[PDB]
Each structure stands twice: as structure tokens, then as C-alpha cells.
């Protein structure tokens, strides 16, 4: 049982003079989630030790109470980058729209993980206010931010990000390109079809994997033939993805491209043409 005997016990250990007992009590508060711990952890958001601030920030997002937003909103400006991350993580876990503008500021942080998690947090909130700032994070020097901004821009699904993500399919890092491809797949814009088709000729076996799945999500038929040559991909999963992504873009355009592969197809391209022409 979630008995309050342990709850209020760790709660009183937040004012303990031992750092270890403090944040270890904050972690138990997050794993318990009993809402009688919101105010004690809000006071712990300014503990002299950063980990107690980190643990209390994380625990506030674990309880999921609206009263932690504005405290965590101020905890975004914490001196310690881990507390800034934990508050930005917790704000994304609470997902209150009050945190959008602070997380937009955390998109301009210095820890490339706070900006990374502020992006991910703004993706969970899904507030269209965060679209334009996330587009600026598609130019952040850290790839994990560019990639997390791309993932967040696709989770928001706002069309404003399409062309910024289209130009993010030409980024030097393959992970942000993996995200920009996955993002444009979730947004499902017809504009991204031609750039994702060119992304099917990417050196990264993951960008080809996402761009294949993306074009399957978009369901556009301009990528039917670019997915046929993707069925001859050296990466196994890009081939299987294009097999999945072609069953999505159904119709005769894929059917007529299957009967030419049930006749003149070889390898894995023949393998799914017969199986599709079986299960139309």
C-alpha cells in the first residue's frame, strides 16, 4: 500500500542536514507520487546541493501536479545544468502550457542536453508556440539538439517545420537527418516527398530507413519507384521498411510495380511483390 507513513517520512528528510538523505528522499517521493509532497519538493528546488535540486525537480515531474510548473519554470534558470535539465524534463512530463515559453528559453540554454530536453519537452507539450523556436534549434551546433528539435517538430506535426526539416535532411549529422526524416514522416507533407526521395540515397542506413518509413507515412505515390530501388538496399531494415512503406501507399501504382517484380524482380524485391500480390 502507498501508506503515508513512508510518504511523510521521506518528506521530513528533505530538510535533513545530510545531502544523501535529502535527494534519496526526493527520489522516493517521485516513485511514490503521493501529492502531499509537491510543496516540500518545491522548497527543495532551491536546496544548496544541486542533486537535491535535481532529484526534487525530477520527482516533481514524477508526481505530475500543476503546482510544480511555475517552480520548475524558475528552476529552468538554475545555476546547475543538471537541475536545468531535470526541470526541463519534469516540465515536459507535466506538460503544462505554462512551461512552453520557459522551455523556449531553455532552447537557448548552454548545456546541449537542456536544449535537447527542452526540445523534447516542447514536443510533449505540443504547443504550436514552440514550433518557430524549435526551427531555430534545427541550427543548434549540437547534433542532439538539432535532432531533438526535429523530433519535437515532427511530434508537434506543424507544417511550418516541413521546409526547415526538408533542409535538415541535408545536415552533416545522420541522426538529425534520421529525425528530420522521421519528423517529415509524422507531419506527412507532400513537400517532403522529393527531399525524402533524395534522402533514400543517403550514406546512412538509418536516414534511408527513416526516409523510407517517412514516405510510407506520407502515402504519396511520387516515391513508389524510389522505394523500389530502396528494396535493393544493402541495409536489411531499409529493405523491410520499404516493404512496409509500399503496402501503405497502396493502389495500382504499387500493384503494377509488383507485377513487374513478380515477373522480373529478383532478391528481396521479388520476395514482397508476390506476397503483396497475394495479400492485396
Amino acid at each position: 500500500h502507498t501508506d503515508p507513513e513512508k510518504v511523510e517520512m521521506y518528506i521530513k528528510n528533505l530538510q535533513d542536514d545530510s545531502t544523501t538523505v535529502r535527494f534519496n528522499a526526493a527520489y522516493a517521493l517521485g516513485k511514490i507520487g503521493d501529492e502531499r509532497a509537491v510543496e516540500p519538493l518545491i522548497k527543495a528546488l532551491k536546496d544548496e546541493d544541486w542533486l537535491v535540486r535535481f532529484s526534487a525537480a525530477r520527482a516533481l515531474g514524477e508526481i505530475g501536479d500543476e503546482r510544480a510548473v511555475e517552480p520548475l519554470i524558475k528552476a529552468l534558470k538554475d545555476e546547475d545544468s543538471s537541475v536545468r535539465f531535470s526541470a526541463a524534463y519534469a516540465l515536459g512530463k507535466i506538460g503544462d502550457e505554462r512551461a512552453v515559453e520557459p522551455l523556449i528559453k531553455a532552447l537557448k540554454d548552454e548545456d546541449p542536453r537542456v536544449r535537447r530536453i527542452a526540445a523534447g519537452a516542447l514536443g510533449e507539450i505540443g504547443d504550436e508556440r514552440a514550433v518557430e523556436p524549435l526551427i531555430k534549434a534545427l541550427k543548434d551546433e549540437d547534433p542532439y539538439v538539432r535532432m531533438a528539435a526535429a523530433y519535437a517538430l515532427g511530434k508537434i506535426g506543424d507544417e511550418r517545420a516541413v521546409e526547415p526539416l526538408i533542409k535538415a535532411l541535408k545536415d552533416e549529422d545522420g541522426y538529425v537527418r534520421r529525425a528530420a526524416a522521421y519528423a517529415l514522416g509524422k507531419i506527412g507533407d507532400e513537400r517532403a516527398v522529393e527531399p525524402l526521395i533524395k534522402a533514400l540515397k543517403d550514406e546512412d542506413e538509418n536516414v534511408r530507413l527513416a526516409a523510407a518509413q517517412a514516405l510510407g507515412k506520407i502515402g504519396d505515390e511520387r516515391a513508389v519507384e524510389p522505394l523500389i530501388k530502396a528494396l535493393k538496399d544493402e541495409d536489411r531494415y531499409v529493405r523491410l521498411t520499404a516493404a512496409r512503406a509500399l503496402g501503405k501507399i497502396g493502389g495500382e501504382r504499387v500493384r503494377a510495380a509488383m507485377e513487374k517484380l513478380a515477373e522480373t524482380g529478383t532478391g528481396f524485391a521479388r520476395k514482397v511483390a508476390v506476397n503483396y500480390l497475394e495479400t492485396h
Binding site: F54, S55, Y144, Y151
Partner: protein
């Protein structure tokens, strides 16, 4: 078991009370953790390799050498088999690790390793009912350059999830070797965890 190794080092408390404080739950002496805190700070380990026991390691070490990372090894490895324990020190020679963690609670023949100029530690612990969050070592390592985890092949679906969960909760990347569909980037698709 549970045991970490350390290279020969060279030149190496400061303004860091909460980090050594988090080591105290598992580390024994107050200067024990204090020396193993400076372990993470100097080299600034940027990658944690997770495995079990052998060709799996050269894949992840290649994958650790795949992002310009000064990695740190971690794996199960339980019983003896020649080398292994002896080759723990050669991981630093072969793969250039900055530290290797090996998961024998008793016996703990650590002097078998630290005899040949290789610093080591001791135990830590496994499953615990929310008494002390062991996972926050990733956060202390994150401040010391840990930008990504790298999961070698052979990890169970729990260790895969635990490392991917640790990738979520600490803003860490994880690289695989579920590991073939969208779950290969679940920590990025879902940056914030769930129920």
C-alpha cells in the same frame, strides 16, 4: 559481482559536494568515492558501453570509436575463463577505454587486478525497492562528458530497456547493434518517459 577498473592515469574535492555525496550510498570510504569521483572527471568519459561477457565488445568499442568518444566499459561477466579478468586490463590496450565496470560479491579478488597497476573499486548492488536511485550515476557521468550510452549485442530486453530508460531520464543517447524498428530511437521519439 560489481567492480570497475581504471587505467594507469597520470596527472589528474574541489567545488563538488553533491557528486561525491551520491557515490557514498555504494562506495564505502569517504575518500574511496573521492578517488573514484576524480575517475569520471579527468578523462570525461563520453560513452558507456554495456554488454554481458566477447566479440560483442569490439563491436561497441568500434561503435564507441564511431563518434569520437572516450568510452567507459560496463558488462556483467561473472565467472573465470583465463584472460577475461586478465584481459580486463588489455581492454585499455585494445580499445583504449578510460574505465571498465564489471558486474562474485564475496571473494572479490580485486588485488588480482590492482597488482598490475590498474586502479579498481568494489561492489554496488542490484535490484532495490526505491531506496537509493542507482541510475543517477549516469547524471554524474553526464556532467563529466557522458553524451551517449552504447549497448553492445546480447543485452536482455530488460538491460536494453534499462539502458534506453537511462538514456531518456538523463538526456543520454543510446546506440544499439527491440532494436531494429522505431524502438532503436525510442529515447529520442519519447524524450520524456511514461507510466
Amino acid at each position: 559481482a560489481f567492480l570497475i577498473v581504471k587505467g594507469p592515469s597520470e596527472k589528474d574535492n574541489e567545488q563538488d559536494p553533491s557528486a561525491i555525496a551520491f557515490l557514498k550510498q555504494f562506495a564505502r570510504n569517504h575518500e574511496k568515492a573521492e578517488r573514484f569521483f576524480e575517475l569520471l572527471v579527468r578523462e570525461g568519459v563520453e560513452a558507456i558501453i554495456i554488454a554481458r561477457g566477447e566479440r560483442e565488445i569490439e563491436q561497441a568499442a568500434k561503435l564507441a570509436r564511431e563518434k569520437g568518444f572516450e568510452a567507459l566499459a560496463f558488462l556483467a561477466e561473472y565467472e573465470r575463463r583465463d584472460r577475461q579478468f586478465d584481459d580486463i586490463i588489455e581492454y585499455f590496450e585494445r580499445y583504449g577505454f578510460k574505465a571498465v565496470i564489471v558486474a562474485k560479491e564475496l571473494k572479490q579478488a580485486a588485488q588480482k587486478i590492482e597488482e598490475k597497476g590498474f586502479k579498481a573499486l568494489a561492489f554496488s548492488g542490484r535490484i532495490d525497492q526505491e531506496n537509493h536511485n542507482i541510475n543517477d550515476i549516469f547524471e554524474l557521468l553526464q556532467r563529466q562528458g557522458l553524451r551517449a550510452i552504447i549497448a553492445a549485442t546480447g543485452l536482455s530486453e530488460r538491460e536494453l530497456s534499462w539502458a534506453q530508460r537511462a538514456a531518456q531520464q538523463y538526456g543520454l543517447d543510446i546506440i544499439f547493434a527491440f532494436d531494429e524498428q522505431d524502438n532503436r530511437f525510442k529515447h529520442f521519439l519519447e524524450p520524456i518517459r511514461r507510466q
